[PDB]
Amino acid sequence: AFLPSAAYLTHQQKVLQLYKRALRHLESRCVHRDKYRYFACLLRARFDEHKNEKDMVKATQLLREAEKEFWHGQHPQPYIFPESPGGTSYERYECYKVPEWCLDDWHPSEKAMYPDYFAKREQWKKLRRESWEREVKQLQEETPVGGPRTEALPPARKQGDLPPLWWHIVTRPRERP
Amino acid sequence: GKRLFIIKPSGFYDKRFLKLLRFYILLTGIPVVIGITLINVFIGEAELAEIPEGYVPEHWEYFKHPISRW
Amino acid sequence: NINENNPFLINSIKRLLIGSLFAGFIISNNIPPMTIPQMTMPHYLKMTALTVTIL
Amino acid sequence: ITKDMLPGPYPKTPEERAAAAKKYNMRVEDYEPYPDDGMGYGDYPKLPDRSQQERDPWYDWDHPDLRLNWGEPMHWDLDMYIRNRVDTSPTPVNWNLMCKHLFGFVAFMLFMFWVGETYPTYQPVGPKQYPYNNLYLERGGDPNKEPEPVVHYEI
Amino acid sequence: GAHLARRYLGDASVEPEPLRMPTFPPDYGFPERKEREMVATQQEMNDAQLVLQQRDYCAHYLIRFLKCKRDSFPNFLACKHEQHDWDYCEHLDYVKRMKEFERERRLLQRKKRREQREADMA
Amino acid sequence: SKMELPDYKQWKIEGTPLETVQEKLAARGLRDPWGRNEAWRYMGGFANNVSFVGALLKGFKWGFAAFVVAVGAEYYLES
Amino acid sequence: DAPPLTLEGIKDRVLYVLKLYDKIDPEKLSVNSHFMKDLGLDSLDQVEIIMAMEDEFGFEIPDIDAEKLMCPQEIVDYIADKKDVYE
Amino acid sequence: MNLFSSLTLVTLILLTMPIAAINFNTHKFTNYPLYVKTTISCAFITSMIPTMMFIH
Amino acid sequence: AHIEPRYRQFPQLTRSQVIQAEFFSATMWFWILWRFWHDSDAVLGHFPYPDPSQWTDEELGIPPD
Amino acid sequence: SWDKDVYPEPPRRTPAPSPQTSLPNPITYLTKAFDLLVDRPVTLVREFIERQHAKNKYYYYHREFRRVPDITECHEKDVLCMFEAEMQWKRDYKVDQEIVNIIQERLKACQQREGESHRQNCAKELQQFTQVVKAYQDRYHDLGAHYSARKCLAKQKQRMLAERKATKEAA
Amino acid sequence: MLKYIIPTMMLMPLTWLSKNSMIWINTTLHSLLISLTSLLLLNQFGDNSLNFSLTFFSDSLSTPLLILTMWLLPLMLMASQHHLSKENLARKKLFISMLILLQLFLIMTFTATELIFFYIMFEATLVPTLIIITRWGNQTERLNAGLYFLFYTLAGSLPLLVALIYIQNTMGSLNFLILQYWVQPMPNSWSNTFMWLACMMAFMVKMPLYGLHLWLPKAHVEAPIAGSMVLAAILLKLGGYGMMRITLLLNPITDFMAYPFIMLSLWGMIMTSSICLRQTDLKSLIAYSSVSHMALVIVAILIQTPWSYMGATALMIAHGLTSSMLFCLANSNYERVHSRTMILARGLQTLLPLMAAWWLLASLTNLALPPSINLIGELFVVMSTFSWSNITIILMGLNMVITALYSLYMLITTQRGKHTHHINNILPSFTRENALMSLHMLPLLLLSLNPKIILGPLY
Amino acid sequence: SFPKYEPSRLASLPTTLDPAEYDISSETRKAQAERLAIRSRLKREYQLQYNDPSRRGVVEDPALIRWTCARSANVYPNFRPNTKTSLLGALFGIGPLIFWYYVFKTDRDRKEKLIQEGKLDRTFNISY
Numbered sequence A: 001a002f003l004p005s006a007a008y009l010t011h012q013q014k015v016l017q018l019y020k021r022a023l024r025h026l027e028s029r030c031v032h033r034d035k036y037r038y039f040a041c042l043l044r045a046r047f048d049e050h051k052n053e054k055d056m057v058k059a060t061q062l063l064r065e066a067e068k069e070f071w072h073g074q075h076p077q078p079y080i081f082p083e084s085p086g087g088t089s090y091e092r093y094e095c096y097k098v099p100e101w102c103l104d105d106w107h108p109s110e111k112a113m114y115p116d117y118f119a120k121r122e123q124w125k126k127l128r129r130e131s132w133e134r135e136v137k138q139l140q141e142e143t144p145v146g147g148p149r150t151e152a153l154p155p156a157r158k159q160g161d162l163p164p165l166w167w168h169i170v171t172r173p174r175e176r177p
Numbered sequence B: 001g002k003r004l005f006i007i008k009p010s011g012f013y014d015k016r017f018l019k020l021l022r023f024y025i026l027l028t029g030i031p032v033v034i035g036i037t038l039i040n041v042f043i044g045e046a047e048l049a050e051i052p053e054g055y056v057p058e059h060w061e062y063f064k065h066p067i068s069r070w
Numbered sequence C: 001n002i003n004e005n006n007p008f009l010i011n012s013i014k015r016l017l018i019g020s021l022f023a024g025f026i027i028s029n030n031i032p033p034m035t036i037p038q039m040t041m042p043h044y045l046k047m048t049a050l051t052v053t054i055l
Numbered sequence D: 001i002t003k004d005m006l007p008g009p010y011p012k013t014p015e016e017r018a019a020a021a022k023k024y025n026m027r028v029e030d031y032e033p034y035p036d037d038g039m040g041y042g043d044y045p046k047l048p049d050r051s052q053q054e055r056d057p058w059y060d061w062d063h064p065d066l067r068l069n070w071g072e073p074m075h076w077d078l079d080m081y082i083r084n085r086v087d088t089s090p091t092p093v094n095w096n097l098m099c100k101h102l103f104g105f106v107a108f109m110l111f112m113f114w115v116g117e118t119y120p121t122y123q124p125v126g127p128k129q130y131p132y133n134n135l136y137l138e139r140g141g142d143p144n145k146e147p148e149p150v151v152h153y154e155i
Numbered sequence E: 001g002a003h004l005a006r007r008y009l010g011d012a013s014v015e016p017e018p019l020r021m022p023t024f025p026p027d028y029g030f031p032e033r034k035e036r037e038m039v040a041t042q043q044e045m046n047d048a049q050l051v052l053q054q055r056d057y058c059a060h061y062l063i064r065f066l067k068c069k070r071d072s073f074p075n076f077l078a079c080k081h082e083q084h085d086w087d088y089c090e091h092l093d094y095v096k097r098m099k100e101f102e103r104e105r106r107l108l109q110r111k112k113r114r115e116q117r118e119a120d121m122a
Numbered sequence F: 001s002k003m004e005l006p007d008y009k010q011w012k013i014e015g016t017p018l019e020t021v022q023e024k025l026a027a028r029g030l031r032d033p034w035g036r037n038e039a040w041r042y043m044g045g046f047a048n049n050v051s052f053v054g055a056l057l058k059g060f061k062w063g064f065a066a067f068v069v070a071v072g073a074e075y076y077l078e079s
Numbered sequence G: 001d002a003p004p005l006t007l008e009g010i011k012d013r014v015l016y017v018l019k020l021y022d023k024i025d026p027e028k029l030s031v032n033s034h035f036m037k038d039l040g041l042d043s044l045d046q047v048e049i050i051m052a053m054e055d056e057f058g059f060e061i062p063d064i065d066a067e068k069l070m071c072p073q074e075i076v077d078y079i080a081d082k083k084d085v086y087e
Numbered sequence H: 001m002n003l004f005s006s007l008t009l010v011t012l013i014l015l016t017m018p019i020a021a022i023n024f025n026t027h028k029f030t031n032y033p034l035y036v037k038t039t040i041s042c043a044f045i046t047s048m049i050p051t052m053m054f055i056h
Numbered sequence I: 001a002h003i004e005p006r007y008r009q010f011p012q013l014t015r016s017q018v019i020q021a022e023f024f025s026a027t028m029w030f031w032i033l034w035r036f037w038h039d040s041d042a043v044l045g046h047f048p049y050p051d052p053s054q055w056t057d058e059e060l061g062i063p064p065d
Numbered sequence J: 001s002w003d004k005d006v007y008p009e010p011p012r013r014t015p016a017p018s019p020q021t022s023l024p025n026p027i028t029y030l031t032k033a034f035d036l037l038v039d040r041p042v043t044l045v046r047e048f049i050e051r052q053h054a055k056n057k058y059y060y061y062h063r064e065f066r067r068v069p070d071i072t073e074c075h076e077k078d079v080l081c082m083f084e085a086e087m088q089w090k091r092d093y094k095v096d097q098e099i100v101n102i103i104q105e106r107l108k109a110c111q112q113r114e115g116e117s118h119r120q121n122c123a124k125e126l127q128q129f130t131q132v133v134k135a136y137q138d139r140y141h142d143l144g145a146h147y148s149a150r151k152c153l154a155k156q157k158q159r160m161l162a163e164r165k166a167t168k169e170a171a
Numbered sequence K: 001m002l003k004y005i006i007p008t009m010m011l012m013p014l015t016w017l018s019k020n021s022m023i024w025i026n027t028t029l030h031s032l033l034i035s036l037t038s039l040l041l042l043n044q045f046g047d048n049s050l051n052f053s054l055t056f057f058s059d060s061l062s063t064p065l066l067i068l069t070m071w072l073l074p075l076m077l078m079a080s081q082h083h084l085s086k087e088n089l090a091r092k093k094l095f096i097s098m099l100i101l102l103q104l105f106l107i108m109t110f111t112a113t114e115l116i117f118f119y120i121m122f123e124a125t126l127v128p129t130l131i132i133i134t135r136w137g138n139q140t141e142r143l144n145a146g147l148y149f150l151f152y153t154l155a156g157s158l159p160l161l162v163a164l165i166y167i168q169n170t171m172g173s174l175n176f177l178i179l180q181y182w183v184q185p186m187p188n189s190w191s192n193t194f195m196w197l198a199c200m201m202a203f204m205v206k207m208p209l210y211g212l213h214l215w216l217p218k219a220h221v222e223a224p225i226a227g228s229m230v231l232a233a234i235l236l237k238l239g240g241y242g243m244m245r246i247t248l249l250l251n252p253i254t255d256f257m258a259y260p261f262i263m264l265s266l267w268g269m270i271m272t273s274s275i276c277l278r279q280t281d282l283k284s285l286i287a288y289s290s291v292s293h294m295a296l297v298i299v300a301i302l303i304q305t306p307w308s309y310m311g312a313t314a315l316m317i318a319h320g321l322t323s324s325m326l327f328c329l330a331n332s333n334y335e336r337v338h339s340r341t342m343i344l345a346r347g348l349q350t351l352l353p354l355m356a357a358w359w360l361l362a363s364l365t366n367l368a369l370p371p372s373i374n375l376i377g378e379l380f381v382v383m384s385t386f387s388w389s390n391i392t393i394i395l396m397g398l399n400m401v402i403t404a405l406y407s408l409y410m411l412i413t414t415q416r417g418k419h420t421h422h423i424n425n426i427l428p429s430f431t432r433e434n435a436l437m438s439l440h441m442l443p444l445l446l447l448s449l450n451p452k453i454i455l456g457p458l459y
Numbered sequence L: 001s002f003p004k005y006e007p008s009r010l011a012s013l014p015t016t017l018d019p020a021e022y023d024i025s026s027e028t029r030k031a032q033a034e035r036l037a038i039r040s041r042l043k044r045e046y047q048l049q050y051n052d053p054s055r056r057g058v059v060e061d062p063a064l065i066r067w068t069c070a071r072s073a074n075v076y077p078n079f080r081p082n083t084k085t086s087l088l089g090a091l092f093g094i095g096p097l098i099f100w101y102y103v104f105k106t107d108r109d110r111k112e113k114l115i116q117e118g119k120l121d122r123t124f125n126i127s128y
């Protein structure tokens, strides 16, 4: 479907995703632990019965009828984790995730309350502006002609330099700011 | 132990504006309230009375509060 | 990490618990009668609410 | 920006269709403009009309709240298909069945309310009796006239 | 609620309508029938500010209960005797209304039987 | 800071409903490998919880005793 | 509320959960033991392991990151990155 | 009569005071939620008196 | 001090909260038993309900004709 | 103080307090505390302020307008006489509005004061309100945002023609 | 009225003889002094208007509009001095001069006793605004916006000149004090039908009516901030003042000639609010909201009842203040992010909290939160239209629901949600912007304490 | 069997019930690779403009400008008056106006006719 590094989903990936969704929905229908354990073992036996099938069209039809079976017997509202999308506390703390570039607009009167922190911030910014040209030069010669094929980034090959495009995924805000 | 820096936008300028607004409102608000209290206590309001015969009032003698008459 | 030993939570729940125990009695005995209460009814109509809740 | 990146009129030849598909950053086979009925769309692509809720929530989008990517062709009704607005996600029950079930429930409740209004319940009692000509003066009747006497006897 | 089934599932010629009742003269079958007696004066109910639906034929007990409620402050559980007396006289009035309904039902049944006999000869 | 986990040998599924699930699956011919993971909820302080009627009747003994004492005190106080 | 986490506690808890698995001999696994090769497990066993660790730590690992979690050290590093520990 | 209306209006004014207290504040308030809670408890007592008058 | 969190075990309890919970449950049951011993009428019934089939036709004024 | 004839009010009749129970009511203690702590300092402060006010005394008067000829005796397109008549009519319009306000305030006061027996004891106030509202409606209603004395004169003339026709057809 | 005209024309040598850095200080200071001086017009009487001279008078309708104009001028001086920072000094003085000239024409417009002098000033107001829009506007289509605005106004207003001259020749005077006493009924004919159309279409265009509103989302958008403020706050109310003054001569033909425009303006506000629901531009959304509120004022004037007139003048003043504040807030966002798209800059409450509070207050007054004078005007118009007919309550309720919907959609889109990742030039709010917001807000909130001074001449 | 999921306008078909998802043919793989290449190239452009330490401003999105220009400034150049446009304009432009005109005219005629006979209760109506 929508993948950063791959253009498609393999057959085994589809089977594993179906297995996880079916087990989660069966846990939702079977709220007690022992009952869920019993029916999870039954579902695991059903999945292991057709594990060794070499016919591609037959495995595809088995997957399609399994997806139809899951859609007929899904929970009207399954159990979603609190931080998972669709959860009760999903994206709750996004109002407190202030980006780090707002510290450059602070008044010097309130910058004096944290001298050592702002010194460390200054040396971090010095490191970033020193490494930017090296990392973009590394990225320029590693992309094949015609643009990149996937969205994966390369690491730093030699010693001393940081991986390319590292700033906004290292300085991201914490989960609980 | 384990105190973390909390990144927040610069709140200095907003507080400065609020302090300036409060100071410049109160700079004339406090003397006006004091003056209104002193007008009300010591000068006081007018008392309704019938017009004497042959006497015509001025146009500002038809109001009660001293400030409205002024 | 189960804990409920905070004075604020215990005190608020305690106050509303005392309310939910006695406030209906106190209020219903303190209000003046603004209508005529219907108190003559057959046995099955008197026990309807309790039997329905028990069922 | 330039005038050759902005939208234009409906493409007729395959050459301008390919040029427009390259302009909107999409494949020529997947690029379908709106039909040329004069509504005013131009060559803007007809994207599959799905809400942003149907997007993958675990993907690293450039705009995470909108689930939108930088440079991607933006739908004509994107401000309508945001997560704050109209949803098009699949439902556990078929849409027609939910419609008929809800309508049948509402209609049956209205019909039975009408039936109960027609045949109400009551108690085996007579009318309530009030003194002083059914409280004539208390109900706002003027005292200079005299009402018809309402007399309640014992039983 | 057997009368509900006797009127709706049964026949409506015997069961009286509650909205129009009684349909018979009060002297029918009742020689020298007397009226009800009102104890509370019109002024007494007027200046005690009783609710107009509360000024029925037993408002004297209500006035006594209200005076007992006012004079016993802050003892809000002080007197239940006046409340019980008012409730008992309410019960007696309700029994009177039930007697009126049963009388109307029996009179309607008797009239139906009379017309059935009149059809039996004529 | 640093916290110490308990032993893992002590989570045995015997005496729990997971043993019943084990013998049902053994009758069918299957196994649950995660049975020892869920075995903590059925042992220790979480064992033998009350029923619904026992939950509604919490503190009924002391309430009934206080009611009997108060009724006897009111019986003696009226004389 | 919300007690903090460390790599030692994360590793101890993940090894506890993996030790309670009946399909793994507890005297053989370590922090960098592989699943398909070093332990002889199927892909379904990996899926059930990942679901067990999700239930243990109370947060969901997406599938596109779940397919690549193949040894306990990568599970520890993924949880440490997602929960931002040692700050 | 002079106690009834005075206590009702002062219950309302007592409730509206902490809004003006927080609006005219410069430094960080020293346990402002405790101040609001104490204000509401006092307002509950002050409004509890006229209901006793009405019950009487 | 506070309560130390436990792993996979029944959590630590204060004696104060157990005492408070038991006291308030006992207070609720005492109140219910007391009010049922005293009132017993708001639940059971205040006045007897007279069946209208047992009323004689003389006191209802039914003429035999 | 106000005038008790324009704003009437029946005499207050309060019952005597009868403490049937022996429990002390807190209302008497709270009234004692209110008179000790609240009424006395406020009374003293008002006494001081009134003493300050009595040192100098000055008066304000109620404006009196003499009657000028109305619009019925004004020549058409004569702006002076019509101007004076229009100003007089507007002043009487304002006074009539406030008269209706006075009667409405009387009605609301009666409805609150009489309690639950308001439907019987506020018959006179309802009659006064009905009469004054009928007069106001017959005098000033349906004139528009551009009301003037000429519009009111035309409305009164049309109503008088209707009344004369009605009494002619009923004769 | 010469005590306000003469300091206004004396503002011109003040801005043309000041230093290179002291033009804003001097002009703002002395305009604020004249704005304080403008309170002397509140000497209104219950029977007679305040008649100064043969040419000038000011009753209780023109007084709030005058005070609003003279207060609005220093706000525009404070707002327009950031985007004119790098401009040539002579062009800066020319901009301030056009603002001064527009204020002079506006204060001579509301006090004109003669109707032809009112017309001359009301069409003299066209030139400074057209010059401001087409010179200091930022976009390509400011020229097209100026053409549309100019030609809509002139095509609407030339028959008004012809009809006013006809009224002068037929009645003998255009003095408003004379015409109050010399007025005659206008019978039903085709001649009087076209008289009504000629006298009404200029103010129907300027207000604007639905269907003649096509110039507004152009002139309100391609203008600078000061131009948008003076277009939304004052210039739309010239039409309202004109219909309030000119309806006196058009009776009783108004009662059936007002039906098509009542149907146009009752249905038009639903259409413009629905347009506001699906707007990608913030400035265009504010302009269409202005169209809806002026449609409300059109209906109130056309049904011609006292409650409708009081609601109309209160709603005019309230909408002027609210629209000016909303345009100022949108301009501050535009200065921060250099784009007018509503979906671009999101989640600004985490970065600009006090500006978010100002946004919330402006949105709350936009949807008529009681007891603001917005709600007072809207409520009085609703009562009068209910007296007119009962299904107007259905239309008004639908309009109120959609108005709350788009105001909160504005607020939730711009201020709430997750912030834009790649935008990192969100500077903290200046003292100037906050002072501008507070000077828009505090009179609006204070007028709820004494709302009787904005309720027209028949309060 | 199981009841087939019928899609609607407001309830799309799920991606796990689409028969075209399970296609393995090389043309669809080539199409998916081309789409991934376009997406990765655009993401590379965005991240190059995004992680620049010397940039302080707005990374301009030509897609958003394209969308706003299409929504606003293209409708009339790409409008042709035909049967559909004129029919929809006459339905949505003069339809509701005529309908509301007739409704309000009928209501006001009925009210004004009832008033002049004195059949409408206007006893306390002095506010208008």
Ligand SMILES: CCCCCCCCCCCCCCCCCC(=O)OC[C@H](COP(=O)([O-])OCC[N+](C)(C)C)OC(=O)CCCCCCCCCCCCCCCCC
Pocket (backbone or CB within 6 Å): K152, K155, K156, K159, K162, K163, K166, K191, K192, K194, K195, K197, K198, K201, K205
């Ligand atoms: C913004 C766009 C829309 C603008 C709309 C403007 C208004 C529409 C109607 C205007 C009509 C023209 C002015 C009429 C003034 C009437 C004054 C008067 O005394 O009337 C009574 C007089 C009566 O004549 P009289 O007064 O000389 O005679 C004495 C009276 N009788 C007749 C009894 C003997 O009316 C006329 O003389 C004719 C009036 C109708 C004129 C028709 C031609 C114009 C048609 C409309 C043109 C609208 C603008 C078009 C262009 C738009 C832009 C491209």
Ligand SMILES: *C(=O)CCCCCCCCCCCCC
Pocket (backbone or CB within 6 Å): C044, C045, C048, C051, D121, D122, E001, E002, E003, E004
């Ligand atoms: C005749 O039936 C008189 C009673 C009123 C009508 C029927 C009411 C039925 C519901 C109440 C009884 C419910 C018993 C569980």
